[PDB]
Amino acid sequence: SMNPPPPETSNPNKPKRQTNQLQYLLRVVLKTLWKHQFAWPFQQPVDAVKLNLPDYYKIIKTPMDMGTIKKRLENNYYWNAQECIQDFNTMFTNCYIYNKPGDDIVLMAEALEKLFLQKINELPTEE
Amino acid sequence: SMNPPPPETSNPNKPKRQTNQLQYLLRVVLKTLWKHQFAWPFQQPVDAVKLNLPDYYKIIKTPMDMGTIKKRLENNYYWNAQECIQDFNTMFTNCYIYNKPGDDIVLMAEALEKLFLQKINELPTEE
């Protein structure tokens, strides 16, 4: 499989809003995860052509990566903070789906997911 | 063409010994790194002609790879664990020497090096 186009990051056909929760997700959560030692394999869509991984987009039909989440936040793609949280969960579960329990890349995603969970525990109150 | 012969893996004129530390380096450390998802670029000597890296062996004069380290452990090439740990260090620093900060291949090597360091943290006590 060649690579698919990356997920859409702008939507001219939705209303936009900025909230405490969405700003926190960008300025705290994404930033903290981006800088983590384990983040780099998750920062851009898997380049299956470069890695020579023909089965990746045969198996992962809902790809997601931190770069896409960053762009969606910056473009006000999300109306509800849960839409963004869902994208993070898609990125972590994609790693568990493609790989196997106990794999090193899985342990990396698990550490990232634990940190993400710790940070969104502190998301500002829905206002 | 362009590749040197691989590093020597047997040494008939050197005494041999088996130790818990050498056992651990082969059966725990090497095995763990070998199975890492990022291991593949480091499992065999760099084929500079196949990768078209004609300068590789003009820059890297002390090549090292995990396949060599595996053979050296299997052949009792090392008397001291530090000789093996030095070979791992050489393999990682060779990656940093030839490539540049931020390259994917370097980020792979850094992750393997940090896991290697965690593993040899738990090397069994010397005799």
PDB file of all heavy atoms in Angstrom, chain A residues 9-40:
ATOM      1  N   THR A   9      -7.706  18.572   7.989  1.00  0.00           N
ATOM      2  CA  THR A   9      -7.430  19.397   9.154  1.00  0.00           C
ATOM      3  C   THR A   9      -8.189  20.709   9.161  1.00  0.00           C
ATOM      4  O   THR A   9      -8.080  21.462  10.134  1.00  0.00           O
ATOM      5  CB  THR A   9      -5.931  19.693   9.262  1.00  0.00           C
ATOM      6  OG1 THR A   9      -5.509  20.460   8.125  1.00  0.00           O
ATOM      7  CG2 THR A   9      -5.152  18.391   9.340  1.00  0.00           C
ATOM      8  N   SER A  10      -8.923  21.015   8.104  1.00  0.00           N
ATOM      9  CA  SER A  10      -9.747  22.207   8.052  1.00  0.00           C
ATOM     10  C   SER A  10     -11.124  21.802   7.562  1.00  0.00           C
ATOM     11  O   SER A  10     -11.274  20.844   6.803  1.00  0.00           O
ATOM     12  CB  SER A  10      -9.155  23.264   7.111  1.00  0.00           C
ATOM     13  OG  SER A  10      -7.845  23.619   7.505  1.00  0.00           O
ATOM     14  N   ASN A  11     -12.144  22.527   8.013  1.00  0.00           N
ATOM     15  CA  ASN A  11     -13.509  22.270   7.571  1.00  0.00           C
ATOM     16  C   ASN A  11     -14.206  23.610   7.450  1.00  0.00           C
ATOM     17  O   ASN A  11     -14.645  24.185   8.458  1.00  0.00           O
ATOM     18  CB  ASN A  11     -14.248  21.343   8.525  1.00  0.00           C
ATOM     19  CG  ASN A  11     -15.474  20.699   7.889  1.00  0.00           C
ATOM     20  OD1 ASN A  11     -16.103  21.272   6.993  1.00  0.00           O
ATOM     21  ND2 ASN A  11     -15.819  19.497   8.355  1.00  0.00           N
ATOM     22  N   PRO A  12     -14.311  24.145   6.234  1.00  0.00           N
ATOM     23  CA  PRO A  12     -14.988  25.431   6.043  1.00  0.00           C
ATOM     24  C   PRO A  12     -16.477  25.362   6.311  1.00  0.00           C
ATOM     25  O   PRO A  12     -17.123  26.413   6.399  1.00  0.00           O
ATOM     26  CB  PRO A  12     -14.706  25.766   4.568  1.00  0.00           C
ATOM     27  CG  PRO A  12     -13.711  24.733   4.087  1.00  0.00           C
ATOM     28  CD  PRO A  12     -13.885  23.543   4.963  1.00  0.00           C
ATOM     29  N   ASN A  13     -17.040  24.165   6.450  1.00  0.00           N
ATOM     30  CA  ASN A  13     -18.475  23.995   6.607  1.00  0.00           C
ATOM     31  C   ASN A  13     -18.890  23.724   8.052  1.00  0.00           C
ATOM     32  O   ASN A  13     -20.021  23.279   8.279  1.00  0.00           O
ATOM     33  CB  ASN A  13     -18.967  22.867   5.693  1.00  0.00           C
ATOM     34  CG  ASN A  13     -18.946  23.255   4.226  1.00  0.00           C
ATOM     35  OD1 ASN A  13     -19.448  24.312   3.840  1.00  0.00           O
ATOM     36  ND2 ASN A  13     -18.353  22.403   3.400  1.00  0.00           N
ATOM     37  N   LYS A  14     -18.011  23.972   9.037  1.00  0.00           N
ATOM     38  CA  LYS A  14     -18.484  23.923  10.420  1.00  0.00           C
ATOM     39  C   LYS A  14     -18.287  25.276  11.102  1.00  0.00           C
ATOM     40  O   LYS A  14     -17.291  25.961  10.842  1.00  0.00           O
ATOM     41  CB  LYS A  14     -17.782  22.847  11.296  1.00  0.00           C
ATOM     42  CG  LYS A  14     -17.240  21.609  10.627  1.00  0.00           C
ATOM     43  CD  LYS A  14     -16.712  20.614  11.689  1.00  0.00           C
ATOM     44  CE  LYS A  14     -15.325  20.079  11.348  1.00  0.00           C
ATOM     45  NZ  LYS A  14     -14.996  18.709  11.823  1.00  0.00           N
ATOM     46  N   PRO A  15     -19.202  25.679  11.990  1.00  0.00           N
ATOM     47  CA  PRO A  15     -18.918  26.831  12.853  1.00  0.00           C
ATOM     48  C   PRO A  15     -17.710  26.546  13.730  1.00  0.00           C
ATOM     49  O   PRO A  15     -17.366  25.396  13.999  1.00  0.00           O
ATOM     50  CB  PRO A  15     -20.198  26.993  13.687  1.00  0.00           C
ATOM     51  CG  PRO A  15     -20.905  25.683  13.580  1.00  0.00           C
ATOM     52  CD  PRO A  15     -20.543  25.118  12.233  1.00  0.00           C
ATOM     53  N   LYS A  16     -17.049  27.611  14.162  1.00  0.00           N
ATOM     54  CA  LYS A  16     -15.835  27.508  14.959  1.00  0.00           C
ATOM     55  C   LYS A  16     -16.047  28.196  16.298  1.00  0.00           C
ATOM     56  O   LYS A  16     -16.827  29.150  16.411  1.00  0.00           O
ATOM     57  CB  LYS A  16     -14.617  28.134  14.252  1.00  0.00           C
ATOM     58  CG  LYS A  16     -14.171  27.425  12.981  1.00  0.00           C
ATOM     59  CD  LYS A  16     -13.380  28.366  12.084  1.00  0.00           C
ATOM     60  CE  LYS A  16     -13.141  27.764  10.706  1.00  0.00           C
ATOM     61  NZ  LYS A  16     -12.341  26.514  10.778  1.00  0.00           N
ATOM     62  N   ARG A  17     -15.351  27.694  17.314  1.00  0.00           N
ATOM     63  CA  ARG A  17     -15.359  28.322  18.621  1.00  0.00           C
ATOM     64  C   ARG A  17     -14.028  28.024  19.304  1.00  0.00           C
ATOM     65  O   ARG A  17     -13.365  27.029  19.003  1.00  0.00           O
ATOM     66  CB  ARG A  17     -16.562  27.835  19.446  1.00  0.00           C
ATOM     67  CG  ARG A  17     -16.327  26.486  20.123  1.00  0.00           C
ATOM     68  CD  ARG A  17     -17.459  26.151  21.070  1.00  0.00           C
ATOM     69  NE  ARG A  17     -17.537  24.713  21.337  1.00  0.00           N
ATOM     70  CZ  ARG A  17     -18.437  24.162  22.148  1.00  0.00           C
ATOM     71  NH1 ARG A  17     -19.328  24.933  22.751  1.00  0.00           N
ATOM     72  NH2 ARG A  17     -18.437  22.852  22.363  1.00  0.00           N
ATOM     73  N   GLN A  18     -13.623  28.922  20.196  1.00  0.00           N
ATOM     74  CA  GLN A  18     -12.450  28.709  21.032  1.00  0.00           C
ATOM     75  C   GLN A  18     -12.900  28.629  22.480  1.00  0.00           C
ATOM     76  O   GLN A  18     -13.657  29.487  22.949  1.00  0.00           O
ATOM     77  CB  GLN A  18     -11.423  29.825  20.843  1.00  0.00           C
ATOM     78  CG  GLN A  18     -10.871  29.883  19.432  1.00  0.00           C
ATOM     79  CD  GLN A  18     -10.165  31.185  19.135  1.00  0.00           C
ATOM     80  OE1 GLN A  18      -8.939  31.232  19.052  1.00  0.00           O
ATOM     81  NE2 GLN A  18     -10.938  32.257  18.977  1.00  0.00           N
ATOM     82  N   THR A  19     -12.465  27.585  23.175  1.00  0.00           N
ATOM     83  CA  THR A  19     -12.871  27.357  24.553  1.00  0.00           C
ATOM     84  C   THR A  19     -11.632  27.124  25.404  1.00  0.00           C
ATOM     85  O   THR A  19     -10.551  26.819  24.896  1.00  0.00           O
ATOM     86  CB  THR A  19     -13.827  26.154  24.695  1.00  0.00           C
ATOM     87  OG1 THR A  19     -13.108  24.933  24.513  1.00  0.00           O
ATOM     88  CG2 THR A  19     -14.942  26.217  23.658  1.00  0.00           C
ATOM     89  N   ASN A  20     -11.815  27.281  26.715  1.00  0.00           N
ATOM     90  CA  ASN A  20     -10.761  26.948  27.672  1.00  0.00           C
ATOM     91  C   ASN A  20     -10.235  25.544  27.429  1.00  0.00           C
ATOM     92  O   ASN A  20      -9.019  25.313  27.474  1.00  0.00           O
ATOM     93  CB  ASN A  20     -11.292  27.050  29.104  1.00  0.00           C
ATOM     94  CG  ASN A  20     -11.483  28.480  29.570  1.00  0.00           C
ATOM     95  OD1 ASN A  20     -12.406  28.774  30.333  1.00  0.00           O
ATOM     96  ND2 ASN A  20     -10.614  29.383  29.113  1.00  0.00           N
ATOM     97  N   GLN A  21     -11.138  24.586  27.187  1.00  0.00           N
ATOM     98  CA  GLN A  21     -10.723  23.189  27.047  1.00  0.00           C
ATOM     99  C   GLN A  21      -9.887  22.978  25.794  1.00  0.00           C
ATOM    100  O   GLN A  21      -8.834  22.327  25.841  1.00  0.00           O
ATOM    101  CB  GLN A  21     -11.952  22.273  27.037  1.00  0.00           C
ATOM    102  CG  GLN A  21     -12.699  22.282  28.355  1.00  0.00           C
ATOM    103  CD  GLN A  21     -13.714  21.155  28.444  1.00  0.00           C
ATOM    104  OE1 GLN A  21     -14.272  20.732  27.433  1.00  0.00           O
ATOM    105  NE2 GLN A  21     -13.966  20.674  29.658  1.00  0.00           N
ATOM    106  N   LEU A  22     -10.332  23.531  24.662  1.00  0.00           N
ATOM    107  CA  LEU A  22      -9.587  23.378  23.414  1.00  0.00           C
ATOM    108  C   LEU A  22      -8.234  24.081  23.482  1.00  0.00           C
ATOM    109  O   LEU A  22      -7.228  23.553  23.003  1.00  0.00           O
ATOM    110  CB  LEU A  22     -10.408  23.910  22.241  1.00  0.00           C
ATOM    111  CG  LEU A  22     -11.619  23.043  21.874  1.00  0.00           C
ATOM    112  CD1 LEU A  22     -12.599  23.793  20.996  1.00  0.00           C
ATOM    113  CD2 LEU A  22     -11.154  21.790  21.193  1.00  0.00           C
ATOM    114  N   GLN A  23      -8.187  25.267  24.082  1.00  0.00           N
ATOM    115  CA  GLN A  23      -6.913  25.953  24.237  1.00  0.00           C
ATOM    116  C   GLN A  23      -5.962  25.151  25.117  1.00  0.00           C
ATOM    117  O   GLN A  23      -4.759  25.069  24.838  1.00  0.00           O
ATOM    118  CB  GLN A  23      -7.155  27.347  24.812  1.00  0.00           C
ATOM    119  CG  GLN A  23      -5.907  28.081  25.250  1.00  0.00           C
ATOM    120  CD  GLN A  23      -6.230  29.474  25.788  1.00  0.00           C
ATOM    121  OE1 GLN A  23      -7.170  29.646  26.568  1.00  0.00           O
ATOM    122  NE2 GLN A  23      -5.444  30.470  25.378  1.00  0.00           N
ATOM    123  N   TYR A  24      -6.477  24.557  26.192  1.00  0.00           N
ATOM    124  CA  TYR A  24      -5.629  23.745  27.059  1.00  0.00           C
ATOM    125  C   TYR A  24      -5.090  22.531  26.307  1.00  0.00           C
ATOM    126  O   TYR A  24      -3.915  22.172  26.454  1.00  0.00           O
ATOM    127  CB  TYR A  24      -6.423  23.334  28.303  1.00  0.00           C
ATOM    128  CG  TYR A  24      -5.702  22.398  29.255  1.00  0.00           C
ATOM    129  CD1 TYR A  24      -4.913  22.887  30.289  1.00  0.00           C
ATOM    130  CD2 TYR A  24      -5.824  21.024  29.121  1.00  0.00           C
ATOM    131  CE1 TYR A  24      -4.258  22.011  31.173  1.00  0.00           C
ATOM    132  CE2 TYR A  24      -5.190  20.153  29.985  1.00  0.00           C
ATOM    133  CZ  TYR A  24      -4.409  20.640  31.000  1.00  0.00           C
ATOM    134  OH  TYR A  24      -3.790  19.733  31.840  1.00  0.00           O
ATOM    135  N   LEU A  25      -5.926  21.918  25.465  1.00  0.00           N
ATOM    136  CA  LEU A  25      -5.511  20.735  24.718  1.00  0.00           C
ATOM    137  C   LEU A  25      -4.337  21.050  23.800  1.00  0.00           C
ATOM    138  O   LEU A  25      -3.437  20.224  23.620  1.00  0.00           O
ATOM    139  CB  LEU A  25      -6.693  20.194  23.920  1.00  0.00           C
ATOM    140  CG  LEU A  25      -7.682  19.377  24.759  1.00  0.00           C
ATOM    141  CD1 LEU A  25      -9.031  19.239  24.053  1.00  0.00           C
ATOM    142  CD2 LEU A  25      -7.086  18.020  25.051  1.00  0.00           C
ATOM    143  N   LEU A  26      -4.325  22.253  23.227  1.00  0.00           N
ATOM    144  CA  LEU A  26      -3.259  22.668  22.328  1.00  0.00           C
ATOM    145  C   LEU A  26      -2.045  23.141  23.102  1.00  0.00           C
ATOM    146  O   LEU A  26      -0.926  22.654  22.879  1.00  0.00           O
ATOM    147  CB  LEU A  26      -3.747  23.795  21.407  1.00  0.00           C
ATOM    148  CG  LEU A  26      -2.716  24.320  20.396  1.00  0.00           C
ATOM    149  CD1 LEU A  26      -2.007  23.163  19.664  1.00  0.00           C
ATOM    150  CD2 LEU A  26      -3.361  25.292  19.411  1.00  0.00           C
ATOM    151  N   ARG A  27      -2.250  24.075  24.036  1.00  0.00           N
ATOM    152  CA  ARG A  27      -1.157  24.793  24.677  1.00  0.00           C
ATOM    153  C   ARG A  27      -0.531  24.028  25.833  1.00  0.00           C
ATOM    154  O   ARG A  27       0.557  24.400  26.281  1.00  0.00           O
ATOM    155  CB  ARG A  27      -1.648  26.161  25.173  1.00  0.00           C
ATOM    156  CG  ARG A  27      -1.908  27.165  24.057  1.00  0.00           C
ATOM    157  CD  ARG A  27      -1.088  28.434  24.234  1.00  0.00           C
ATOM    158  NE  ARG A  27      -1.440  29.482  23.272  1.00  0.00           N
ATOM    159  CZ  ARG A  27      -0.798  30.643  23.179  1.00  0.00           C
ATOM    160  NH1 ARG A  27       0.219  30.895  23.988  1.00  0.00           N
ATOM    161  NH2 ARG A  27      -1.172  31.555  22.288  1.00  0.00           N
ATOM    162  N   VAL A  28      -1.192  22.992  26.334  1.00  0.00           N
ATOM    163  CA  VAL A  28      -0.656  22.171  27.415  1.00  0.00           C
ATOM    164  C   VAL A  28      -0.529  20.718  26.979  1.00  0.00           C
ATOM    165  O   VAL A  28       0.557  20.144  27.024  1.00  0.00           O
ATOM    166  CB  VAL A  28      -1.506  22.296  28.694  1.00  0.00           C
ATOM    167  CG1 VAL A  28      -0.999  21.315  29.739  1.00  0.00           C
ATOM    168  CG2 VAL A  28      -1.448  23.716  29.235  1.00  0.00           C
ATOM    169  N   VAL A  29      -1.642  20.094  26.583  1.00  0.00           N
ATOM    170  CA  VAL A  29      -1.626  18.642  26.369  1.00  0.00           C
ATOM    171  C   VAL A  29      -0.754  18.277  25.175  1.00  0.00           C
ATOM    172  O   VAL A  29       0.225  17.535  25.311  1.00  0.00           O
ATOM    173  CB  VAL A  29      -3.046  18.092  26.193  1.00  0.00           C
ATOM    174  CG1 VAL A  29      -2.967  16.592  25.970  1.00  0.00           C
ATOM    175  CG2 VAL A  29      -3.872  18.400  27.407  1.00  0.00           C
ATOM    176  N   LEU A  30      -1.118  18.766  23.986  1.00  0.00           N
ATOM    177  CA  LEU A  30      -0.349  18.466  22.780  1.00  0.00           C
ATOM    178  C   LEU A  30       1.114  18.845  22.962  1.00  0.00           C
ATOM    179  O   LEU A  30       2.014  18.079  22.600  1.00  0.00           O
ATOM    180  CB  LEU A  30      -0.960  19.205  21.581  1.00  0.00           C
ATOM    181  CG  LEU A  30      -0.525  18.954  20.123  1.00  0.00           C
ATOM    182  CD1 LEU A  30       0.788  19.678  19.776  1.00  0.00           C
ATOM    183  CD2 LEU A  30      -0.452  17.466  19.792  1.00  0.00           C
ATOM    184  N   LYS A  31       1.367  20.013  23.552  1.00  0.00           N
ATOM    185  CA  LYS A  31       2.740  20.469  23.732  1.00  0.00           C
ATOM    186  C   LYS A  31       3.529  19.508  24.615  1.00  0.00           C
ATOM    187  O   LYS A  31       4.677  19.164  24.306  1.00  0.00           O
ATOM    188  CB  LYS A  31       2.746  21.881  24.334  1.00  0.00           C
ATOM    189  CG  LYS A  31       3.966  22.151  25.215  1.00  0.00           C
ATOM    190  CD  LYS A  31       4.060  23.618  25.639  1.00  0.00           C
ATOM    191  CE  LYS A  31       3.585  23.795  27.078  1.00  0.00           C
ATOM    192  NZ  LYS A  31       4.480  24.632  27.937  1.00  0.00           N
ATOM    193  N   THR A  32       2.918  19.055  25.713  1.00  0.00           N
ATOM    194  CA  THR A  32       3.590  18.140  26.636  1.00  0.00           C
ATOM    195  C   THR A  32       3.876  16.804  25.970  1.00  0.00           C
ATOM    196  O   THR A  32       4.982  16.251  26.087  1.00  0.00           O
ATOM    197  CB  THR A  32       2.715  17.936  27.875  1.00  0.00           C
ATOM    198  OG1 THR A  32       2.600  19.180  28.574  1.00  0.00           O
ATOM    199  CG2 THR A  32       3.292  16.869  28.815  1.00  0.00           C
ATOM    200  N   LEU A  33       2.880  16.260  25.278  1.00  0.00           N
ATOM    201  CA  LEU A  33       3.103  14.999  24.586  1.00  0.00           C
ATOM    202  C   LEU A  33       4.110  15.162  23.462  1.00  0.00           C
ATOM    203  O   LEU A  33       4.950  14.286  23.264  1.00  0.00           O
ATOM    204  CB  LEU A  33       1.795  14.430  24.049  1.00  0.00           C
ATOM    205  CG  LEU A  33       0.727  13.993  25.042  1.00  0.00           C
ATOM    206  CD1 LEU A  33      -0.276  13.110  24.336  1.00  0.00           C
ATOM    207  CD2 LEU A  33       1.357  13.268  26.196  1.00  0.00           C
ATOM    208  N   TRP A  34       4.065  16.283  22.726  1.00  0.00           N
ATOM    209  CA  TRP A  34       4.971  16.444  21.592  1.00  0.00           C
ATOM    210  C   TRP A  34       6.421  16.338  22.027  1.00  0.00           C
ATOM    211  O   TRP A  34       7.258  15.760  21.320  1.00  0.00           O
ATOM    212  CB  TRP A  34       4.741  17.790  20.907  1.00  0.00           C
ATOM    213  CG  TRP A  34       5.444  17.881  19.609  1.00  0.00           C
ATOM    214  CD1 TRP A  34       6.760  18.188  19.391  1.00  0.00           C
ATOM    215  CD2 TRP A  34       4.866  17.647  18.329  1.00  0.00           C
ATOM    216  NE1 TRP A  34       7.037  18.173  18.034  1.00  0.00           N
ATOM    217  CE2 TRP A  34       5.885  17.837  17.366  1.00  0.00           C
ATOM    218  CE3 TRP A  34       3.586  17.293  17.899  1.00  0.00           C
ATOM    219  CZ2 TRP A  34       5.654  17.683  16.001  1.00  0.00           C
ATOM    220  CZ3 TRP A  34       3.360  17.154  16.537  1.00  0.00           C
ATOM    221  CH2 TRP A  34       4.389  17.340  15.610  1.00  0.00           C
ATOM    222  N   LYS A  35       6.731  16.886  23.192  1.00  0.00           N
ATOM    223  CA  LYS A  35       8.091  16.989  23.677  1.00  0.00           C
ATOM    224  C   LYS A  35       8.567  15.716  24.370  1.00  0.00           C
ATOM    225  O   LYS A  35       9.742  15.615  24.716  1.00  0.00           O
ATOM    226  CB  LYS A  35       8.165  18.201  24.612  1.00  0.00           C
ATOM    227  CG  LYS A  35       7.888  19.526  23.880  1.00  0.00           C
ATOM    228  CD  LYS A  35       7.725  20.715  24.846  1.00  0.00           C
ATOM    229  CE  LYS A  35       9.044  21.083  25.496  1.00  0.00           C
ATOM    230  NZ  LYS A  35      10.211  20.635  24.691  1.00  0.00           N
ATOM    231  N   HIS A  36       7.697  14.733  24.559  1.00  0.00           N
ATOM    232  CA  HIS A  36       8.101  13.515  25.239  1.00  0.00           C
ATOM    233  C   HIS A  36       9.105  12.730  24.397  1.00  0.00           C
ATOM    234  O   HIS A  36       9.039  12.718  23.168  1.00  0.00           O
ATOM    235  CB  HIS A  36       6.879  12.660  25.559  1.00  0.00           C
ATOM    236  CG  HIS A  36       7.161  11.581  26.552  1.00  0.00           C
ATOM    237  ND1 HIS A  36       7.752  10.390  26.194  1.00  0.00           N
ATOM    238  CD2 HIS A  36       6.971  11.523  27.890  1.00  0.00           C
ATOM    239  CE1 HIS A  36       7.895   9.632  27.266  1.00  0.00           C
ATOM    240  NE2 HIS A  36       7.430  10.296  28.310  1.00  0.00           N
ATOM    241  N   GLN A  37      10.062  12.103  25.087  1.00  0.00           N
ATOM    242  CA  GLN A  37      11.073  11.265  24.448  1.00  0.00           C
ATOM    243  C   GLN A  37      10.473  10.243  23.478  1.00  0.00           C
ATOM    244  O   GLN A  37      11.073   9.935  22.439  1.00  0.00           O
ATOM    245  CB  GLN A  37      11.878  10.569  25.550  1.00  0.00           C
ATOM    246  CG  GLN A  37      12.538   9.280  25.186  1.00  0.00           C
ATOM    247  CD  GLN A  37      13.213   8.639  26.387  1.00  0.00           C
ATOM    248  OE1 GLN A  37      14.314   8.106  26.279  1.00  0.00           O
ATOM    249  NE2 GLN A  37      12.553   8.700  27.544  1.00  0.00           N
ATOM    250  N   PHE A  38       9.298   9.696  23.801  1.00  0.00           N
ATOM    251  CA  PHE A  38       8.676   8.646  22.991  1.00  0.00           C
ATOM    252  C   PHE A  38       7.789   9.174  21.871  1.00  0.00           C
ATOM    253  O   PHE A  38       7.183   8.372  21.157  1.00  0.00           O
ATOM    254  CB  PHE A  38       7.826   7.732  23.867  1.00  0.00           C
ATOM    255  CG  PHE A  38       8.603   6.917  24.847  1.00  0.00           C
ATOM    256  CD1 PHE A  38       7.955   6.332  25.920  1.00  0.00           C
ATOM    257  CD2 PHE A  38       9.952   6.691  24.679  1.00  0.00           C
ATOM    258  CE1 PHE A  38       8.651   5.567  26.831  1.00  0.00           C
ATOM    259  CE2 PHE A  38      10.656   5.924  25.579  1.00  0.00           C
ATOM    260  CZ  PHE A  38      10.006   5.354  26.658  1.00  0.00           C
ATOM    261  N   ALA A  39       7.720  10.490  21.669  1.00  0.00           N
ATOM    262  CA  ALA A  39       6.691  11.040  20.795  1.00  0.00           C
ATOM    263  C   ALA A  39       7.003  10.889  19.308  1.00  0.00           C
ATOM    264  O   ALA A  39       6.066  10.788  18.509  1.00  0.00           O
ATOM    265  CB  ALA A  39       6.472  12.530  21.099  1.00  0.00           C
ATOM    266  N   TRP A  40       8.276  10.903  18.911  1.00  0.00           N
ATOM    267  CA  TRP A  40       8.578  11.110  17.498  1.00  0.00           C
ATOM    268  C   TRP A  40       7.933  10.096  16.542  1.00  0.00           C
ATOM    269  O   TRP A  40       7.552  10.517  15.435  1.00  0.00           O
ATOM    270  CB  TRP A  40      10.107  11.195  17.297  1.00  0.00           C
ATOM    271  CG  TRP A  40      10.842   9.914  17.516  1.00  0.00           C
ATOM    272  CD1 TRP A  40      11.442   9.494  18.662  1.00  0.00           C
ATOM    273  CD2 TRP A  40      11.052   8.887  16.547  1.00  0.00           C
ATOM    274  NE1 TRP A  40      12.002   8.252  18.473  1.00  0.00           N
ATOM    275  CE2 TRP A  40      11.792   7.867  17.174  1.00  0.00           C
ATOM    276  CE3 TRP A  40      10.684   8.731  15.204  1.00  0.00           C
ATOM    277  CZ2 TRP A  40      12.170   6.705  16.510  1.00  0.00           C
ATOM    278  CZ3 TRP A  40      11.062   7.575  14.544  1.00  0.00           C
ATOM    279  CH2 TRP A  40      11.797   6.578  15.196  1.00  0.00           C
TER     280      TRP A  40
END
